[PDB]
Paper text:
IsdB is part of the S. aureus iron-regulated surface determinant (Isd) system, which plays an important role in the acquisition of iron from the human host. IsdB removes heme from hemoglobin and transports it to downstream Isd proteins, where heme is transported into the cell and degraded so that iron is released for use in fundamental cellular processes. IsdB binds hemoglobin and heme using widely conserved NEAr iron transport (NEAT) domains. One class of IGHV1-69-encoded mAbs blocks S. aureus heme acquisition by binding to the heme-binding site of NEAT2, while two additional classes reduce the bacterial burden in vivo by an alternative Fc receptor-mediated mechanism.
Efforts to crystallize NEAT2 in complex with STAU-399 or STAU-229 were unsuccessful. For STAU-229, we found that the NEAT2 peptide MTDLQDTKY (residues 342 to 350) showed reduced deuterium incorporation in the presence of Fab. We projected this epitope onto the surface of NEAT2 and designated this region antigenic site 3. The interaction of STAU-299 with antigenic site 3 shows recognition of Isd-NEAT2 near α-helix 3, using STAU-299 CDR-H3 as the predominant interacting loop. Because STAU-229 is encoded by the IGHV1-69-2*01 allele, this mAb has a different inferred germ line gene sequence than that of STAU-399. The residues in positions 52 to 54, encoding the key amino acid motif PIF that was conserved in all of the IGHV1-69*01-encoded antibodies, are changed to PED. The I53E and F54D alternate residues encoded by the IGHV1-69-2*01 gene make this germ line-encoded CDR-H2 loop more polar and hydrophilic than that encoded by IGHV1-69*01. Similar to the studies that we describe here, repertoire studies with human antibody responses to the influenza virus hemagglutinin stem region show both canonical CDR-H2-mediated IGHV1-69*01 allele (F54 residue)-encoded interactions and noncanonical IGHV1-69*09 allele (non-F54)-encoded interactions mediated by CDR-H3 (38). It was interesting that the STAU-229 mAb described here is encoded by IGHV1-69-2*01, which lacks the F residue needed for heme-binding-site recognition, and indeed, this mAb recognizes an alternate antigenic site. Conversely, when STAU-229 and STAU-399 were incubated with IsdB and associated with hemoglobin, we did not detect a difference in the binding signal compared to those for IsdB and hemoglobin binding alone. STAU-229 significantly reduced the burden in the kidneys.
Numbering used by the authors:
A (entry chain H): 1 to 143, 153 to 199, 208 to 228
B (entry chain L): 3 to 212
The structure:
């Protein structure tokens, strides 16, 4: 019954500030602390700190000291985490986590000792100096068929084939992050083949028929 | 702050033990060590608390222990879905929660599979924009690690090379991508270009030419 609902994905310029939310249901809000954990892409779990919603007292990990602010709102059962002066090194998934109660009365459940048993889905945050740009779409043909989706930002991109009528033998590859800050991906198919490339952030839709 | 081996591995029905080495200030002097299991794209799931206790719903196969400054997690009767990242965590003197680096556990069900390589030349369209991109598509390999090397004629090129990480496919094999950026002039000056994909010692190659 306990659900932790985090706010949606964020894309942020360096030097900006983010503030993400963790909405809480299934238990008495002020009886449990609330923790925040950072996870860089392909890296480990790193503790950010906690807040006790009963008294609003916080404790931040030394690594984020001065940049982070955790606040709680008992009227909406929501915990917020704000991270200041962002850089790309802060590109990561950010979880909220409710302390696990192993005691007989579950009051002032700090989470220092018995771990955290319920986590929010995570909030993905991308920090890049790049700005929004739609893709160019080029055919891929031998001398197996597909489209090259070049130099877009940010994620994501949707690629279908023949308005979704073509589902068999289609392989869309995860994009590469160029050192230019832009992404490029390829989607391949193994009588007419048309790309339907969708990049909602830039409001670009490209239909590309490949020989 | 807590030290775990980067990776561990075990066959179905066999067993594996994951070490978590810390300090006396955390794992040594406190029985507050947690273990978390994390499947891809999912939030961690608490598996052990207080060194050896298991939350409701965690099978007995996950067995926690510690000796001095080093805590361990053993998993027995390995199944496929035990494959995940496992993190230890502990209380640390001074009111802090400290984590380990995590261990990627692999369960060895799937046979080793060589990558299928497809190399695409630059499009005439792109050449008109005075750019040229060679696309090397790598699919259906297991385990999920390759190295990629490009060649102009017989000469290796590493400038302009961009390679993705391995990503699990829907069929539980892995995929990856590598892009070679060139000028139109470089593309036309060579007899051919080739993308060489090495997988568990064995290399698969594809070639294209102007």
């Amino acid at each position: 019954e306990v659900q932790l609902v985090q706010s949606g994905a964020e894309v942020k310029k360096p030097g900006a500030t983010m503030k993400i939310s963790c909405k809480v249901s299934g238990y008495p809000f002020t009886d449990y602390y609330m923790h925040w954990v950072q996870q860089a892409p392909g890296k480990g779990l790193e503790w950010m700190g906690l807040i006790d919603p009963e008294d609003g007292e916080t404790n931040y990990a030394e690594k984020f000291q001065g940049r982070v602010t955790i606040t709680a709102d008992t009227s909406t059962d929501t915990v917020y985490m704000e991270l200041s002066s962002l850089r790309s090194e802060d590109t990561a998934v950010y979880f909220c986590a409710k302390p696990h109660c192993s005691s007989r009365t579950c009051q002032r459940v700090s989470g220092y000792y018995f771990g955290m048993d319920v986590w929010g889905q995570g909030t993905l945050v991308t920090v890049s100096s790049a700005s929004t740009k739609g893709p160019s779409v080029f055919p891929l043909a031998p001398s197996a068929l597909g489209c090259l989706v070049k130099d877009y930002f940010p994620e994501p991109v949707t690629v279908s084939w023949n308005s979704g009528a073509l589902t068999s033998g289609v392989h869309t590859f995860p994009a590469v992050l160029q050192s230019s800050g832009l992404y490029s991906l390829s989607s391949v198919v193994t009588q007419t083949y048309i790309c339907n490339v969708n990049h909602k952030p830039s409001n670009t839709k490209v239909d590309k028929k490949v020989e | 702050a807590l030290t775990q081996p980067p990776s561990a591995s075990g066959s179905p029905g066999q067993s594996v033990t994951i070490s978590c080495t810390g300090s006396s200030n955390d794992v040594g002097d406190y029985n507050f060590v947690s273990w978390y299991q994390q499947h891809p794209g999912k939030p961690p799931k608490l598996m052990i608390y207080e060194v050896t206790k298991r939350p409701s719903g965690v099978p007995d196969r996950f067995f926690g222990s510690k000796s001095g400054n080093t805590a361990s997690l053993t998993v027995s009767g390995l199944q496929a879905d035990d494959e995940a990242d496992y993190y230890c965590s502990s209380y640390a003197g001074g009111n802090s929660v400290v984590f380990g680096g995590g261990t990627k556990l692999t369960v060895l069900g799937q046979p080793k599979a060589a990558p299928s390589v497809t190399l695409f030349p630059p499009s005439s369209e792109e050449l008109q924009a005075n750019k040229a991109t060679l696309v090397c598509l790598i699919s259906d390999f297991y385990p999920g690690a390759v190295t990629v090397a490009w060649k102009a004629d017989s000469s290796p090129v590493k400038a302009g090379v961009e390679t993705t990480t391995p990503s699990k496919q829907s069929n539980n094999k892995y995929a990856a991508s590598s892009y070679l950026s060139l000028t139109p002039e470089q593309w036309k000056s060579h007899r051919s270009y080739s993308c060489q994909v090495t997988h568990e010692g064995s290399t698969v190659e594809k070639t294209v030419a102007p």
